[PDB]
Design a protein around this ligand. Sequence first.
Ligand SMILES: Cc1cc2nc3c(=O)[nH]c(=O)nc-3n(C[C@H](O)[C@H](O)[C@H](O)COP(=O)(O)OP(=O)(O)OC[C@H]3O[C@@H](n4cnc5c(N)ncnc54)[C@H](O)[C@@H]3O)c2cc1C
Ligand SMILES: Nc1nc2c(c(=O)[nH]1)N[C@H]1C(S)=C(S)[C@@H](COP(=O)(O)O)O[C@H]1N2
Ligand SMILES: O=c1[nH]c(=O)c2nccnc2[nH]1
Ligand SMILES: O=c1[nH]c(=O)c2nccnc2[nH]1
Ligand code: MOS
Ligand code: MOS
Ligand code: FES
Ligand code: FES
Ligand code: FES
Ligand code: FES
Ligand SMILES: [Ca+2]
Lengths: 164, 164, 305, 755, 51, 151
Amino acid sequence: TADELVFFVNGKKVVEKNADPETTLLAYLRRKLGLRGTKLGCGEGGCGACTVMLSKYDRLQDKIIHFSANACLAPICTLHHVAVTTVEGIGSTKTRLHPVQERIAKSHGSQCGFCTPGIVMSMYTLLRNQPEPTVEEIEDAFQGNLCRCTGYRPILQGFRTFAK
Amino acid sequence: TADELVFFVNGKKVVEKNADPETTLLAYLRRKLGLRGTKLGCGEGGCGACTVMLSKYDRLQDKIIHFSANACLAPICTLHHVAVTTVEGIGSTKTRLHPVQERIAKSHGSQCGFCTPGIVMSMYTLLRNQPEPTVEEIEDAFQGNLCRCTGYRPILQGFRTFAK
Amino acid sequence: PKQLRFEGERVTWIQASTLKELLDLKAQHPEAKLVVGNTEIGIEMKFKNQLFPMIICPAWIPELNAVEHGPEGISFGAACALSSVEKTLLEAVAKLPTQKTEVFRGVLEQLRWFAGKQVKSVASLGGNIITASPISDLNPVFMASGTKLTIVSRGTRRTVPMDHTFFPSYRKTLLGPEEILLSIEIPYSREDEFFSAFKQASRREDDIAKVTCGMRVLFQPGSMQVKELALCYGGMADRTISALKTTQKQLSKFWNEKLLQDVCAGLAEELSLSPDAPGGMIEFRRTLTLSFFFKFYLTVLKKLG
Amino acid sequence: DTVGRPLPHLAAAMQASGEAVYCDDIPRYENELFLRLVTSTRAHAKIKSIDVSEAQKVPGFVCFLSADDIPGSNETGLFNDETVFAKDTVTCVGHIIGAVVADTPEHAERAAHVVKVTYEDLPAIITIEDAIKNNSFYGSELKIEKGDLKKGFSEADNVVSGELYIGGQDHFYLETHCTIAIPKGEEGEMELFVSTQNAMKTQSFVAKMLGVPVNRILVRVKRMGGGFGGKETRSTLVSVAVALAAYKTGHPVRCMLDRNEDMLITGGRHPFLARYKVGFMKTGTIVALEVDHYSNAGNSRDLSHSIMERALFHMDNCYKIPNIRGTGRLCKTNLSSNTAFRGFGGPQALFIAENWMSEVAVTCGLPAEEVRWKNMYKEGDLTHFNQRLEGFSVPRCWDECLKSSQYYARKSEVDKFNKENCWKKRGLCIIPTKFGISFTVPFLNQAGALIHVYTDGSVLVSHGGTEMGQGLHTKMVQVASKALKIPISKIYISETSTNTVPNSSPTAASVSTDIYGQAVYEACQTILKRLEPFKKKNPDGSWEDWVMAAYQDRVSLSTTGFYRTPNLGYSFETNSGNAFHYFTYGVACSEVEIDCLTGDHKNLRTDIVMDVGSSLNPAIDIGQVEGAFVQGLGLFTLEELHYSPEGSLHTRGPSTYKIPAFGSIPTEFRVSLLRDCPNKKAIYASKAVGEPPLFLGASVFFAIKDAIRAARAQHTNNNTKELFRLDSPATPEKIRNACVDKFTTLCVTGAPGNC
Amino acid sequence: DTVGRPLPHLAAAMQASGEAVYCDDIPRYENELFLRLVTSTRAHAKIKSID
Amino acid sequence: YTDGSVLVSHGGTEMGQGLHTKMVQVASKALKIPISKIYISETSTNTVPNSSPTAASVSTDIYGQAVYEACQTILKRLEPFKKKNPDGSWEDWVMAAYQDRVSLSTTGFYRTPNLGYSFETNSGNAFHYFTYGVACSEVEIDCLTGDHKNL
Ligand SMILES: Cc1cc2nc3c(=O)[nH]c(=O)nc-3n(C[C@H](O)[C@H](O)[C@H](O)COP(=O)(O)OP(=O)(O)OC[C@H]3O[C@@H](n4cnc5c(N)ncnc54)[C@H](O)[C@@H]3O)c2cc1C
Ligand SMILES: Nc1nc2c(c(=O)[nH]1)N[C@H]1C(S)=C(S)[C@@H](COP(=O)(O)O)O[C@H]1N2
Ligand SMILES: O=c1[nH]c(=O)c2nccnc2[nH]1
Ligand SMILES: O=c1[nH]c(=O)c2nccnc2[nH]1
Ligand code: MOS
Ligand code: MOS
Ligand code: FES
Ligand code: FES
Ligand code: FES
Ligand code: FES
Ligand SMILES: [Ca+2]
């Protein structure tokens, strides 16, 4: 005798009738839902390759709140009545890229590209909280995202255009 | 609340706790058991591409009886306590070929090779009932087995080597 | 919000809707593990291969998520995310007099280069405090400031200032087996009261040997004569520790060069490390403890001077 | 025609959208299983037993695989000194012993952890000093020796000598090792999908283990999320194990390593210990130099030998040294085997060099840029392995970098700051580099291509190189389009596979664009020659017109292309014959501020000028300048690997091992490509950019060492000609410890001492 | 040199054993779907609707 | 490959007629190596493009010529090493040619000569050659049923 876990991913309702307490969101996304845009880099919260946006009603603030999180650490069992947005939630070369995706691509902010969905989701999240951030706000958004390829310069530069 | 279906394939117990009366042994073997040497050529009993051997204990004869059958038409629901043998139960190039498999190959009895497992199981089933059969019996073995490629002569010739 | 129960291959998970439910559940299964952000328990389960058969998530409980302004300080529920703690403190700092926000500003300095946004958005206050890592960056600050801890079990409630006795041994706190941290009030600083917090910018072993500190002086009114002094350090032992021998010696002494020499002599001895202490970096760690105090000394003189 | 144009990485937009597929992003077969490796917890031990009782009870457990399950051979590795699975003895902590197969990777993890291995410890050797003491080496000493050392040491005003250690490095490719093996079921056939830079040795090694011909094994490599040399060889440790599980079960099997397994198992950059002795004039002119290099090679040979060779090739950096001896010894230790890492022994030898160079300047009391400039090769000069330097463009990079960095003016701002500030200091350093282009093994300097043109005019290029983010495929496409005279949108590269281009060299040594570029180019030339008659009869026709006519005339629209690098073959007996085809050059200027009380530092500004000949893609190439530079800043300043006494790696993820982050990069980060210098050795006059700019991150290291000399002048003594050992990485610990003052000595306390 | 010799078909042994993989014998991906054509029952006709 | 094993790929597909068996026999003969060193896995658009269907009975003719050509190319390349080492094995010449940065991979191609019939003018060859045969059969019919046996 056990409850159903109900949550949303890129706007679609997920009802999981047999949630295992030990299931992380990254494992569910990739291996149950088939959305492999979100990556495993470390499994320990350091690199942000598994970065998603989460949205929930904060029954206190009023407010739907939007924030980022590491999917490799997020138990799906915390996520009852929570909304997840992944890289595929924001746009695609099949329909239209999100402006975040287009800019990091055209600015040479992407090499191997493994770190890129994470950074796109940290940048996407900032924009949902602050559609006119400062340059300082843009840099600190990525405190939790690592890139081994680019030396970071081109990423910040492409995104400065979102500032003011 | 519904009963378990218990048969055997290639000596291995299958326990199907949820048998659909509509499931054929051909579909179950290929699509549930992962055993694809038994083939679909018609779904109506005329080509024998799907030929398997079945064995049951006869309560009366004592005797375990062996016969051939078209897996495309055999409901798995009729197979309770029946033992199935397919082309992969009798030999393989990874272990050792059964004489039948070796003979049809070396006689040039196999061109595209699609009818070959079913022909093998027809011949294997004959030999399992009559270890030294007649040339007459050899041929009637293959009444419900079609081959589009060979013109049949090499199959029969390669297999005559079992009479005498 | 109704309580939810999930069951896996090895683990039972209970999503508590209500404070009363949590305290009943913890009374029945005092060995049950709470999980809020999982930024610590997910590491233990994955990497240290701990199994916790019974998990209670108390994240939905208002209280535990409340932010309360009082006359002594700003109180945060234990399930509050470090991002919210951070947002509320920054707001307090921009709005109040410098002299009331001395402690809020060392909390903020420790949060500065702490993980990243993903971690801070889900890591709770309480999880940090009760994890009691030797290298927690917040525990030294809560200790040096006497941050008050409201602690509750089914039919008990107590509020205790954090002090050196809160951490008896490696990764243990002075909570009985049925108590939960409810809330944490981070104090305004008073007249004649100055606070600094510092950290080593190298971690190299999973939970040891990264120097981190909260430092607090309160002077007699209008003076440079010490009334209270607290210097607390992570990364110098298997727990957060306070240099109490050293600081007791400075009571009623004056903020000067001899005070500087006496504290540093006091520290070199009281926090001294075996040539074989876990973590290595024996001389660097000794030098940081003294060097972080020098910085505090010079800063305090500037807030005076 | 897009060559020379800043065209973004072809896959960039799909990478940003999460649509770009990496090995583990590949959907699973309904029957696909998961492998987890079982690995030594001991540095050197005999295996007494393995008990899998408890692992057998984990839901979904399939099997435990060990050395005895192997049909072909248990003998593996580039030099045949490794096991696939350790048999009787383990010889490092990540040493592969077996593998667990299960139905989920969660179940494979859970089962592997509960496998009981019983051991009996054996005397271990971990450090370079453990190994020298025990003469535990691979092979015999290697050497370049030109001139008379006892005699250069005798015309010499000053002789300085010392020891220097440089720490290793983890590749930290964002995507860890990953293989999928699909057993076909017929004839031994198996198709593998792998994050590897070396699909040929993956193919050979799997076939060898299985005891089947190479022609049975297809390896396909679409992309890696990073390689950095760490996937040039050690990928086979995963690939071979997963192939064996595929063989044994007859099901598809995958494994992607978790970060902590990856850092333990698959090795990294070699730690080097150097002992050096330099002789020089009061002038700073170098007269003799002797260096003995010791690399920590770990528990198998791998690529260690040729790493040591490239090191000795780079021991001069950019400096004419008339008398010179440099040896190299490969230490055999109980650690994970170390491997290729961007620069490939180059950054280490080149660091050792700027180190003694920095001392020469200090000893002579002269300005660093002067002692470096004075000692620089001149265009035409011979190196110590006797190769000539043609198009030696360092002096240009140098003068331009000094000017564009405003070096002389900033060196004064720096001295002004050091006078005004007691507890923080600033450092400034301008450092040159040259890096030799070619595999050091002549037979790896070969490359294939295979081009088809389809009857719509669409073109599929296949070459032997792999995409790991460097934009190889992008550059191959810009070339093919240039050479065929059609837009890039008509051309496509899908993947790398052993069935389209056989016998490929790893994608390594920074030469892929040169050698696949040539292969591709030649295949395009063959195709254009086949098309000439149709161009002739229809001069206004379109490419599609000529293709259809060629096809209807039964002219073949598919060809191989190939390239060998000419006139290569250096000798170690004889000390002669070209080691390299050419050299890439650059200069970097960096400025830092150190906090002398904490050991923290800020990277304030860096200016790089790099000679990359005529750039195929200025955007890709600048991007490589930047990323290589930032990875060398990691090596020299941040990245520190740390082991227990008994040989076990403590630093096994991002919380304990620190690669550069967003906020680690210089506040002002400026990179220029040297204009107007056509390179005639390589495709369309371009130069290898991959590994060359990495050692330029050492300019941050030497600016920090400069900041420290300024802190020691302040608090420790009055000797401005002092020499102090600063090892690499210059971590906060090393920096703080070096700024000797009232705190490091005791005080101030009042305590005598110092200082 | 086997040119001119009665060499058996290279795959015949595997065809006899049921190991030779024909197109439908290829394993399915976990998410693999199946298609069934919808076909005219009239020799010549306008399609007026499909429900 | 460097173990001396050969992978052959050609335009033609296997449908039971033993095409791959006959390309293996041709390539072995052309290379002068045992058939057991040569393998053909399958036919694909990324190895041989723009292929004709395997049809008109000509697959052995035209592929066997394409295979032969490419085998000749390999022999020409392996020649210098065979000369340098007359007494060694196939594997020795192959490894030798690899270390010497000789390419062990090539395409072949073949275009049937002198074809091209005109329906206006009624000239030019339609065919390359003709295959011929004769059969004699005996049958017995049942006049009362319409049945028959082929004797
Ligand atoms: C990448 C990364 C970087 C980090 N960097 C730092 C850093 O720089 N400095 C630092 O100090 N920390 C750091 N941390 C630690 C982090 O701040 C703590 O992991 C986190 O705050 C724990 O909170 P949580 O909600 O995630 O705890 P959980 O993992 O959910 O729980 C942790 C522990 O607290 C208990 N618990 C939770 N709430 C209560 C309660 N109300 N009463 C009693 N027990 C409770 C649980 O039982 C468990 O034992 C880092 C972690 C990560 C992943
Ligand atoms: N983004 C990215 N850039 C990279 C690497 C990588 O793995 N990812 N590898 C480096 C190394 S070690 C080398 S030699 C080259 C390899 O390819 P090239 O030969 O085309 O430059 O890329 C360099 N730049
Ligand atoms: O096997 C290798 N041999 C080499 O000589 C070499 N040189 C540079 C980079 N990788 C290399 N790899
Ligand atoms: O276009 C074709 N012309 C032919 O003669 C032919 N012959 C046999 C099979 N397909 C064929 N196709
Ligand atoms: O030679 Mo760059 O791949 S290691
Ligand atoms: O020519 Mo056979 O395909 S009609
Ligand atoms: S995978 Fe690295 S933080 Fe989640
Ligand atoms: S692009 Fe490779 S890690 Fe960022
Ligand atoms: S498939 Fe033809 S008889 Fe069963
Ligand atoms: S061999 Fe083709 S149908 Fe019998
Ligand atoms: Ca190396």
